[PDB]
Amino acid sequence: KSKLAKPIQDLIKMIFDVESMKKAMVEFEIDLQKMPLGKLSKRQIQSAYSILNEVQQAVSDGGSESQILDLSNRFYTLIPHDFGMKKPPLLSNLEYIQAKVQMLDNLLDIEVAYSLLRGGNEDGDKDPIDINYEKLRTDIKVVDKDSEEAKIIKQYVKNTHAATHNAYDLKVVEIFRIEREGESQRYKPFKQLHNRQLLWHGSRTTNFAGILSQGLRIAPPEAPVTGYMFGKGIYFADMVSKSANYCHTSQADPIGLILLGEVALGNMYELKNASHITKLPKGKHSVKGLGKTAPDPTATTTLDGVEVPLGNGISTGINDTCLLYNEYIVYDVAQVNLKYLLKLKFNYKT
Numbered sequence: 360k361s362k363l364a365k366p367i368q369d370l371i372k373m374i375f376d377v378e379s380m381k382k383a384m385v386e387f388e389i390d391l392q393k394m395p396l397g398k399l400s401k402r403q404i405q406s407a408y409s410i411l412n413e414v415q416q417a418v419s420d421g422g423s424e425s426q427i428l429d430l431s432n433r434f435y436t437l438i439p440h441d442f443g444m445k446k447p448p449l450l451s452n453l454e455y456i457q458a459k460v461q462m463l464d465n466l467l468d469i470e471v472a473y474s475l476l477r478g479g480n481e482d483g484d485k486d487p488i489d490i491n492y493e494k495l496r497t498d499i500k501v502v503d504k505d506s507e508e509a510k511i512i513k514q515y516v517k518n519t520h521a522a523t524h525n526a527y528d529l530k531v532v533e534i535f536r537i538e539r540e541g542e543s544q545r546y547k548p549f550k551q552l553h554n555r556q557l558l559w560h561g562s563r564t565t566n567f568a569g570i571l572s573q574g575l576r577i578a579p580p581e582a583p584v585t586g587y588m589f590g591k592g593i594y595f596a597d598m599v600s601k602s603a604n605y606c607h608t609s610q611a612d613p614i615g616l617i618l619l620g621e622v623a624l625g626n627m628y629e630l631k632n633a634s635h636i637t638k639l640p641k642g643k644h645s646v647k648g649l650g651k652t653a654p655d656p657t658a659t660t661t662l663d664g665v666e667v668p669l670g671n672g673i674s675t676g677i678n679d680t681c682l683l684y685n686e687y688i689v690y691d692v693a694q695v696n697l698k699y700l701l702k703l704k705f706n707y708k709t
């Protein structure tokens with residue numbers, strides 16, 4: 360049997376659940392009959408990105424309709440879709456293409472989870488859970504519910520739950536202190552930067568075996584820069600509300616996972632509108648999309664020398680902005696060091 364604590368066991372069982380991986384793929388409209396979980400390859404996803412990149416170029420620049428048609432057929436043949444009784448939409452709408460780039464981001468993490476799952480499991484001297492936990496190469500520990508560390512994080516969750524996102528409540532079911540192998544080391548050079556904050560990052564539970572083993576990462580070279588609001592970086596938020604929405608939970612599936620990472624922001628390049636950033640301006644270390652609401656700067660605390668914006672959602676003086684909430688993007692995989700993983704319970708208003 361498992362040596363791990365119960366909460367951790369329930370976590371491993373949850374992130375490695377095969378049923379959830381298929382549910383995700385069905386929601387992305389993949390044909391599971393023609394494309395089973397085990398057919399997924401990194402090479403395959405790379406090519407699909409390249410295809411989406413070209414089609415995006417043809418739409419923007421007015422390429423022949425025959426070109427867009429050919430590209431759509433190649434994409435749908437590479438990744439078989441199931442549209443039921445409806446005709447398959449062509450990749451001719453820039454919003455649909457963006458939807459498809461997001462699908463590939465998720466498939467990258469799902470592919471990692473399955474590969475790990477079917478990996479070295481022959482050992483009989485270990486419990487399956489213990490074996491899969493070790494594959495994550497991440498030390499996971501339960502944060503004590505009554506300690507200061509936990510108190511602060513609960514305060515951060517409660518106080519930063521935005522007004523327009525109050526279509527559900529949020530209960531912190533469990534808090535885990537995570538430490539990925541060799542991550543503290545690759546982040547060492549960034550402790551030299553100022554403006555290091557404890558930000559949020561939400562994602563589907565199906566992405567967590569990938570996030571924990573490979574860490575958070577920027578999209579591959581093949582992905583179109585356009586597929587992302589502020590270019591190809593790593594996104595965070597200061598309002599639990601905003602990140603929580605990327606968990607993709609529902610009334611029928613209410614438990615979501617959410618990360619708290621320390622991010623070395625330094626001098627931020629403030630933007631009020633989207634921008635397909637390739638180069639970062641000299642002297643800038645990250646991008647910050649300004650929102651109409653942000654935690655109250657008065658209430659900002661520190662946790663191990665890291666700023667924690669646990670203030671209540673106050674309206675900022677900026678009005679000419681397109682964003683409702685702030686977004687933080689770093690463009691180097693080493694500018695972040697993951698700290699906590701929270702198990703959240705979304706109570707939907709009925």
Ligand SMILES: Cc1nc2c(O)cccc2c(=O)[nH]1
Nearest residue numbers: 559560561594595596602605
């Ligand atoms: C996947 C993800 N994306 C985000 C974003 O684009 C902006 C702000 C936050 C997030 C987040 O938490 N997760």
